[PDB]
Point group: C5
Chain length 310, copies 5
Amino acid sequence: PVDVSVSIFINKIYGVNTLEQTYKVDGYIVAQWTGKPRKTPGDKPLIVENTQIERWINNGLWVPALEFINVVGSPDTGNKRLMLFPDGRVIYNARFLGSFSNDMDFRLFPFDRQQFVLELEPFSYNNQQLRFSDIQVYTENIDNEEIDEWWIRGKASTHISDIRYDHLSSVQPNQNEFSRITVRIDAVRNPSYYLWSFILPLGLIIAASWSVFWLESFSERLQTSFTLMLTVVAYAFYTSNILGRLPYTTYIDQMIIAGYGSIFAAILLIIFAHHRQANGVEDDLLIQRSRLAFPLGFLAIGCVLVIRFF
Amino acid sequence: PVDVSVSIFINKIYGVNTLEQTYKVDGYIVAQWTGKPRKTPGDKPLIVENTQIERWINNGLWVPALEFINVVGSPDTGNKRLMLFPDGRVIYNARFLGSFSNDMDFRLFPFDRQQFVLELEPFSYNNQQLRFSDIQVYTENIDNEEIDEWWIRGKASTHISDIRYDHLSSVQPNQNEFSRITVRIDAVRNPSYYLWSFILPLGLIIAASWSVFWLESFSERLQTSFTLMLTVVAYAFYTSNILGRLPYTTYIDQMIIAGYGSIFAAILLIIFAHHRQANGVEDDLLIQRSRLAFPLGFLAIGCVLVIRFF
Amino acid sequence: PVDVSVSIFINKIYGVNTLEQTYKVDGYIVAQWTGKPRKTPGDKPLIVENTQIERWINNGLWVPALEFINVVGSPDTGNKRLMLFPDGRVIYNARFLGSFSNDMDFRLFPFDRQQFVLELEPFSYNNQQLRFSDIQVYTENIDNEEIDEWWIRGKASTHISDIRYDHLSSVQPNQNEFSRITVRIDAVRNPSYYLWSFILPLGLIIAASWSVFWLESFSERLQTSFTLMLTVVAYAFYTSNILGRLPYTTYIDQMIIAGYGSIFAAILLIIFAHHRQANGVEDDLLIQRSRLAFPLGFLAIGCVLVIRFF
Amino acid sequence: PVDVSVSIFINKIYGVNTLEQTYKVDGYIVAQWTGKPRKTPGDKPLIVENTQIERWINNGLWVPALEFINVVGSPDTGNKRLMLFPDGRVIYNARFLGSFSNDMDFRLFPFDRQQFVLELEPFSYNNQQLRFSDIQVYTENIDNEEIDEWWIRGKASTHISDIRYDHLSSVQPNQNEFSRITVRIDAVRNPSYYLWSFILPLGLIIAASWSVFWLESFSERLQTSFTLMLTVVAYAFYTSNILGRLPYTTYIDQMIIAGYGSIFAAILLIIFAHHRQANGVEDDLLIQRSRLAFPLGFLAIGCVLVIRFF
Amino acid sequence: PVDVSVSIFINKIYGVNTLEQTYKVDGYIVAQWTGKPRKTPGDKPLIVENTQIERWINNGLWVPALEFINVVGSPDTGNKRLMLFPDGRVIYNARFLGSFSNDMDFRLFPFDRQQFVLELEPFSYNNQQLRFSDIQVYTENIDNEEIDEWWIRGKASTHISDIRYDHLSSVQPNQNEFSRITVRIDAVRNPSYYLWSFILPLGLIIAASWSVFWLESFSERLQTSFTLMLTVVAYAFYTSNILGRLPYTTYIDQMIIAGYGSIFAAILLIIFAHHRQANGVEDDLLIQRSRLAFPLGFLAIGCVLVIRFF
Ligand code: NA
Ligand code: NA
């Protein structure tokens, strides 16, 4: 087998698209490995750039292709560099730019923690003939800085894994498992946008929809609460704006459903109160006396969700 | 004729676009077939990667092109591998990534069951000179896991079909039918998103638009019901958001039209009730007595649609 | 001159974009023509696939380029096949996929009938040296089936036309007119989507905006009619959603303007009625007596438009 | 210097995008020029198509590259034709398709007049070694017909200009000015869409918001005028839909701001009128007597803008 | 080391996308450097255009690749020119078109000042073998003119920087720092669009929501203020339209939150006023006496933000 040493440089991470579960990675790929010695002009290694590497491959150079597994489309390679040493180590450099896609789990969406994964494999050389020795990661341009809505934490977590591909069994019986390089880039979201943008105006709308309880006329109790109920229902599709069509709820989702329950229970309580007014002049007191206990109850449900879910 | 053995690996299915009737498939193609024996260096098969397969084709190697029928655009191939055995079997490997399009039928949209089809054909070699022997499918990375709004069930269903192309009749009279590989990937949707997102707030709006019947003043009976009627009409275009401009209705569509009928019959009943008030003080009882029977009627229409349609 | 026989296969029509006046066509191109005889291995015609046709062109083969006139961008060709017969007929096959654009006329939009046109020309060979003999069309996969909002009727209508290009006059004086292949694919829209989706809720809104005439209080006559008037105005941009910024009106457009006239005349009639109430207690009868005659009038305007326009 | 004769054919203009200031042009490029005589087979000029022009360039043919200046991206060339005459004139043909971008000035947007400009330059040959003799334009397929929202007027206006490029001064001291071909295609918009689509419903809304002055109750004067004021404010973003984020106003913009002034002055006048009602029963007459003079005033402001601006 | 002189021409800047933090740059690249002398036909330098530069590279010409660091995707190069002098200076010309991305800081968004940065580096040649001598910038076509929402100020600010790349340490121990060309293009936004488009209608809405204080009936004080409050809340997402999901607020954001505070404090003050009405007939004076002091207070908060923030 042949040892391979890979060094990775990450330029910038951008274009994180939760709707399509994609994100874009910029950087360079450097693969170092050792072969037979050769002769170079001078005692200095040879520089072979693009539209000249193919000529040396046609001469008989062995340059394996190292693909990326978790990409959509094709890695948009730029220039590519081949470095040839007389002593017998061959170094291939290229600038990738890939649109990477991976699984994400949005349970606690405003305060979520994700990771970016990079999965690299040789295309046709198994570890019995091409082994990845080690990788050292270079993340310094994005080491501690904020992506447009995500914060970065710490260094990269890396691992090389060996995975079996059963679909080569008819064409390569026993040696069909591949050395795979896996790199993790941890990332945490900034809650700040949603905190100043949605949970605040919703908070004011909930407060006004509670303050409607202090009124003393029936039309003011119903019509304003109805308009507020419909406009609160109109904010159901905020999660679908940023995220996909997720089968599970978030804090915005759970909060807005709790708001729905509050306003619907309020309008049912008012209707039941008027139905208890048999003559239209007998006044109930206990049924609107909930101005101070149930706000503590709603904050209690909120703090139970906060304590248990965190 | 020449036998061909194809083994298929499916990496991931994503980007299911019901609006354009497209979906994206990642994976690898492996075609195995047997020809004349040859000479290789060593007793080990030769590895010929990209920008070197064309040289061996120019040497006289017979590598047929196996296209995909049901794609939009072109399959975005990546690297391609040619495996050459001295004993006389030639194995071609390539990584496809295609945007696949096929028919879909959205009668029962929230609870629908679809399948993904892959249709492959050689470009110019009929089965009298190129026969597909068999295919074995490899679906393990996506064997039992949820696509972003679709669930996967079971293994792949495969079939090889032989179809006649009449447009080669002027250029190839009798032998113009092609061996086609067909692979089915069954998929079932998750109703969960729409269940928590749309049928619930619509349910609360219908319940409030019914609870308006318990009021005792004319302006409250009309104005709130009118605003609720217009906002219920405003949710007509929800199906057009996810789906296309379909000629047929769904459960959201049938439910929202039933809601339209309920609110329009309610407002007509209220107007007819006031017209029966000849003096403006004579009160009707039978015309608003439908508070308990017609909700059972609406649930009856719903359960009839549920029982008969399922 | 040289005869050319072209046979066309159409795979599927999709992606009809009325906003950009584009549509996508899938299929294969087959051009058959006769030249000088040659020598082949065996008595069987030679199969020359892609990345090998260029070598035979460099050998001295005459393969003309047959472009498409009415495309946007470039035809996304796939594989291409060259068929070489010893007796002297050369057959070129390729899989096109083009985004085709042509004129459309949307006078009667919900019930419109269009056609898809395919315009093909050789790039540089006039009919004095390259003549199109005939074409036979192959439309069987889409022969009788519904495109996502269009129905297909009958077979293809074809014609070969000879058109003069005056811009070669400085470079080719007398022989500058080109043989052009024209294929028509008739298509009719399905009215069903718009029939269940827009003309129905608009019908209910118009009916409610008429039923407001049966009320007996001024505020109920004005405020509800005003809200309904503004929401009917809000549906002006439905045509701009599907279609472009058309200089002419459709049935949705004419219907919604008729609705505008109805609601604006109604609110002016109510204001004029209240102005005729000099003391605020004198009641008019003739000015609201139009509950039964003018609905017949509005249906009369509708049926006049239906009878005359159809 | 070398004379060059260019003849231009324009196929169709489409995809005019005011938001990105782009438009798409289809057509062919024909460049005719005279060089040294040569030998051809027969007495007939040689036809050299694509993937064969490069071989003759490698033979020593001088084919300059004629780029387009005002494009975004790259001109999507199709086939390219080289015509070789024995007498010594070389004719290059190619089918371009470019996305062209240029300045536009939207002062009087609904009734605007623009022009399409085509700017062509050789890439590296100045007029001391490559001179453009003349151009004759061929616009017949689009000579008098309507683009989807633009009308075409007259023939093309052309000019060849010689412009200095100062950035070659370090590499070519004295001879660094380039012969540039400039073609103008005048175009005028059709006001019809906006005339039937926006200025009409806005006209009805303004008329209703004036007709609110004829009412006799305070709540009807305020609430309806408030809802109409907010929905008129809601139509502020119509210009941003079609156009960009322009620093200057249009007729829709000026009209909607005039509407804003009318409704805001009306609501301030009503509030001031009620404040002049000291006892709540004393009635003002002069403050609502403006039903007939200020509509003439608003039409006067409109006709002043029409007369002065046109 | 080898000196390199680079001259840059900028054609046009367009497509500034704050949502994706991208912008597009058009222009040409010219690199001048001196090598060994050679022989040319005549005493005039040789013109080598595209699809001929690669042949001279294969002959043994040393043409380094000068990439751009801060691009997304790949620079869409057009034609490329090589200029060869007999005396020994080699000049490479090419037309780039890149989508450039860089950091932006939107604290004071309507009145912001940004700069466009261009970062260029050789791909594999460090300054010990390739040194950038100097750069002279050519910005004349866009020297003083307005980009579609940005104004340009002054000349370009340029600097050449030398940056260490630690990821070549395993492959090149001591000499791994690269000469980088950095060009700054200062740009200032035009506040005019937002000034006439959003801060004006919001100003009228705030003025009407203040003028509601002059009314004398409870329903008019509540219902209109409630509808205005909800529609003011509805304009929260204006910043998200142009900008991204920013963690920090702007002047539109701070102004709209101040409006939220004004309307919510107003509705709470009205509710508290009615609660102070113990009998429903006792009238408060001090609680609505804030018609003249708190508008001065709101303008005071605005002018404090204006003075301190500027
Ligand atoms: Na009311
Ligand atoms: Na209302």
